[PDB]
Write an enzyme that holds these catalytic residues in place. Structure first.
Site, mmCIF file in Angstrom:
data_model
loop_
_atom_site.group_PDB
_atom_site.id
_atom_site.type_symbol
_atom_site.label_atom_id
_atom_site.label_comp_id
_atom_site.label_asym_id
_atom_site.label_seq_id
_atom_site.Cartn_x
_atom_site.Cartn_y
_atom_site.Cartn_z
ATOM 1 N N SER A 20 0.867 -1.336 0.112
ATOM 2 C CA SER A 20 -0.011 0.069 -0.068
ATOM 3 C C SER A 20 0.759 1.396 -0.054
ATOM 4 O O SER A 20 1.764 1.281 0.724
ATOM 5 C CB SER A 20 -0.967 0.113 1.177
ATOM 6 O OG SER A 20 -0.243 -0.071 2.367
ATOM 7 N N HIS B 100 3.029 7.432 7.758
ATOM 8 C CA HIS B 100 3.072 7.259 9.198
ATOM 9 C C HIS B 100 3.375 8.551 10.073
ATOM 10 O O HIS B 100 3.799 9.599 9.568
ATOM 11 C CB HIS B 100 4.178 6.480 9.708
ATOM 12 C CG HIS B 100 4.281 5.050 8.785
ATOM 13 N ND1 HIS B 100 3.594 3.995 8.863
ATOM 14 C CD2 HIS B 100 5.171 4.958 7.556
ATOM 15 C CE1 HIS B 100 3.931 3.123 7.947
ATOM 16 N NE2 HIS B 100 5.102 3.712 7.236
ATOM 17 N N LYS C 283 6.326 5.758 13.690
ATOM 18 C CA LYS C 283 6.713 4.622 12.964
ATOM 19 C C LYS C 283 7.733 4.713 11.771
ATOM 20 O O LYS C 283 7.513 4.410 10.613
ATOM 21 C CB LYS C 283 5.503 3.442 12.407
ATOM 22 C CG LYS C 283 6.196 2.253 11.941
ATOM 23 C CD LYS C 283 5.110 1.770 11.168
ATOM 24 C CE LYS C 283 5.689 0.137 10.630
ATOM 25 N NZ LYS C 283 5.130 -0.372 9.420
ATOM 26 N N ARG D 79 -3.428 4.863 4.873
ATOM 27 C CA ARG D 79 -3.080 4.427 3.615
ATOM 28 C C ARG D 79 -3.668 5.297 2.523
ATOM 29 O O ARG D 79 -5.051 5.788 2.760
ATOM 30 C CB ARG D 79 -3.628 2.872 3.642
ATOM 31 C CG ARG D 79 -3.328 2.083 4.483
ATOM 32 C CD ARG D 79 -3.952 0.642 4.475
ATOM 33 N NE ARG D 79 -3.957 0.059 5.704
ATOM 34 C CZ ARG D 79 -4.380 0.012 6.743
ATOM 35 N NH1 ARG D 79 -5.850 0.925 6.675
ATOM 36 N NH2 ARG D 79 -4.058 -0.429 8.020
ATOM 37 N N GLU E 32 10.854 4.104 9.482
ATOM 38 C CA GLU E 32 10.818 2.801 8.621
ATOM 39 C C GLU E 32 12.454 2.937 7.836
ATOM 40 O O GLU E 32 12.539 4.265 7.367
ATOM 41 C CB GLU E 32 10.094 2.331 8.001
ATOM 42 C CG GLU E 32 8.806 1.749 8.595
ATOM 43 C CD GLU E 32 7.370 2.027 7.568
ATOM 44 O OE1 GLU E 32 7.784 2.827 6.732
ATOM 45 O OE2 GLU E 32 6.683 0.947 7.764
ATOM 46 N N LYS F 168 -7.696 -2.281 2.385
ATOM 47 C CA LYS F 168 -8.108 -1.617 3.730
ATOM 48 C C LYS F 168 -8.524 -0.247 3.789
ATOM 49 O O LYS F 168 -8.705 0.478 2.635
ATOM 50 C CB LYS F 168 -6.705 -1.762 4.727
ATOM 51 C CG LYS F 168 -5.980 -2.779 5.163
ATOM 52 C CD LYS F 168 -5.837 -4.121 4.444
ATOM 53 C CE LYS F 168 -5.280 -5.296 5.197
ATOM 54 N NZ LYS F 168 -5.405 -6.536 4.163
ATOM 55 N N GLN G 56 1.296 4.735 1.615
ATOM 56 C CA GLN G 56 1.099 4.848 3.011
ATOM 57 C C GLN G 56 2.125 5.885 3.603
ATOM 58 O O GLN G 56 2.819 6.285 2.984
ATOM 59 C CB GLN G 56 1.226 3.670 3.802
ATOM 60 C CG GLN G 56 2.850 3.077 3.498
ATOM 61 C CD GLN G 56 3.243 1.670 4.027
ATOM 62 O OE1 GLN G 56 4.048 1.632 4.922
ATOM 63 N NE2 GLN G 56 2.608 0.763 4.007
ATOM 64 N N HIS H 93 4.861 6.788 0.698
ATOM 65 C CA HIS H 93 5.882 5.858 0.010
ATOM 66 C C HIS H 93 5.093 4.620 -0.265
ATOM 67 O O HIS H 93 4.032 4.577 0.368
ATOM 68 C CB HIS H 93 7.037 5.775 0.878
ATOM 69 C CG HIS H 93 6.733 5.283 2.241
ATOM 70 N ND1 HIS H 93 6.377 6.187 3.341
ATOM 71 C CD2 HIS H 93 6.638 4.077 2.919
ATOM 72 C CE1 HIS H 93 6.014 5.504 4.603
ATOM 73 N NE2 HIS H 93 6.134 4.381 4.224
HETATM 74 ZN ZN LIG Z 1 5.827 2.768 5.710
#
Ligand SMILES: [Zn+2]
Length: 440
Positions: free
Chosen positions: A108, A112, A135, A303, A137, A309, A110, A284
């Protein structure tokens, strides 16, 4: 057996977007680490989990098949260290999750939240926002990788808007107009031109993301016919685009992601060894490849497309930073690492501007071989070999010297110094390791 340096057998997930069977690095790694495990050439092997996640345990094969979470829990000061317990507030687990991803189908689109939004979302919508956290990453290519990351430079967006009828149609001539007229390009961060440029981007994005499904369905059909009938229009934007659109439509037919992903975000290609940091409030997606992934423990995701979802468009449109840096700016800089010395031809620190984790990349030339010594670090570590083979030990203690082949993963206690040597005889590939760690 040592309790300072020990091998862990890690679990994996068979999500439907994973590479199938042995084409997957996850499969390769799992298998090599425990050939006992017969790979189902039919199934996807999506993720290899390394750490203290309750759902997918890493077992200390030499320490009685005990769980890393268990060992840590049992001895936090030894496994985490004081400074870590204190800083992150846990005595049961690591502050990061470390994985290998093997991506066949796009994930997806998305973004954060930061901690401040994370707490806000969690308080307001606990059903969608499981925790309170940010979050961060980081992705590192094991094999060549493709993803989406950040909005494209505004000049690229103006060209797209003027040139792609189906997008122009959705946005509206007045808005297109306003955007193309409005943006102040040679403009640097924080300037009033930078600010007003983001307002313009936000308007465009919001108009797209609020469009009805039926319209999206119609416009995506038209878009695909055009990629077919007039490839040049797309190629003029980016040589890879028309085939990208077609590829992703095959996976998610008539998805809004064909618009908000393919036309609005940077299409980033990572060569193996390169990295990208996924900061908060920046869009991203992972498209394809095998990567090393490191992240904080959060489930908070907003998302935008390529998903069945819940898509929280309201929050999405308001939370983004609306940054518009180049594809080149999406990749992390190489940093040196003074506490490692030796024969490695690459010894690189990937230091994100967050606290939860860091990664050390160590590569030996397949021909040259050699040794590398790394000082004891002030926190726990996980080491995985992605390529080649060598040995690992506690510096100066040969009774700890073990085989580290491709796919092998080790836990390294805080304060233990490590010595790596590249396989003398075996020279197929460059002996390559990735070490995820944290220091307070
Ligand atoms: Zn991510």
């Amino acid at each position: 057996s040592s309790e300072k340096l020990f091998r862990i057998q890690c679990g994996y997930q068979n999500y439907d977007w994973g590479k199938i069977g042995s084409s997957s690095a996850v499969a390769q790694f799992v298998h090599n680490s425990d050939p006992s495990i017969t790979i189902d050439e039919t199934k996807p092997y999506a993720e290899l989990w390394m750490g203290t996640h309750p759902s997918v345990p890493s077992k200390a094969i030499d320490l009685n098949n005990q769980t890393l979470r268990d060992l840590v829990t049992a001895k936090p000061q030894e496994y985490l260290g004081e400074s870590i317990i204190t800083k992150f507030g846990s005595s049961k687990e690591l502050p990061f999750l470390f994985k290998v991803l093997s991506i066949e189908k796009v994930l997806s689109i998305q973004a954060h939240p930061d901690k401040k939004l994370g707490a806000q979302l969690h308080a307001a919508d606990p059903k969608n926002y499981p925790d309170d956290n940010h979050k961060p990453e980081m992705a590192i290519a094991v094999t060549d990788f493709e993803g989406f990351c950040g909005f494209k430079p505004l000049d690229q967006l103006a060209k797209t808007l003027a040139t792609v009828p189906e997008l122009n149609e959705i946005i509206g001539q007045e808005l297109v107009d306003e955007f193309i007229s409005g943006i102040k390009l040679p403009a640097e961060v924080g300037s009033q031109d930078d600010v007003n440029n983001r307002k313009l981007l936000q308007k465009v994005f919001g108009k797209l993301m609020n469009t009805d499904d039926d319209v999206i369905k119609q416009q995506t059909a038209k878009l695909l016919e055009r990629t077919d009938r007039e490839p040049q229009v797309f190629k003029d934007i980016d040589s890879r685009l028309p085939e990208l659109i077609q590829r992703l439509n095959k996976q998610f037919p008539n998805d809004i992601g064909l618009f908000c992903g393919c036309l609005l975000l940077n299409h980033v290609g990572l060569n193996k060894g390169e990295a990208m940091f996924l900061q908060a409030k920046d869009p991203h997606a992972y498209i394809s490849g095998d990567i090393i992934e490191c992240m904080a423990a959060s489930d908070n995701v907003v998302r935008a497309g390529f998903t069945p979802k819940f898509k929280d468009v309201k929050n999405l449109v308001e939370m983004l930073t609306y940054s518009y840096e180049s594809v080149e700016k999406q990749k992390m800089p190489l940093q040196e690492f003074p506490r490692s010395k030796g024969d490695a031809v690459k010894s690189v620190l990937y230091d994100p501007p967050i606290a939860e984790f860091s990664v050390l990349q160590t590569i030996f030339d397949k021909s040259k071989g050699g040794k590398q010594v790394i000082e004891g670090l002030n926190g726990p570590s996980i080491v995985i070999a992605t390529n080649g083979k060598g040995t690992i030990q506690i510096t100066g203690d040969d009774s700890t010297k073990q085989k580290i082949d491709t796919g092998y993963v080790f836990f390294v206690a805080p304060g233990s110094s490590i010595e790596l040597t590249a396989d003398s005889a075996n020279q197929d590939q460059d002996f390559t390791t990735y070490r995820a760690f944290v220091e307070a």
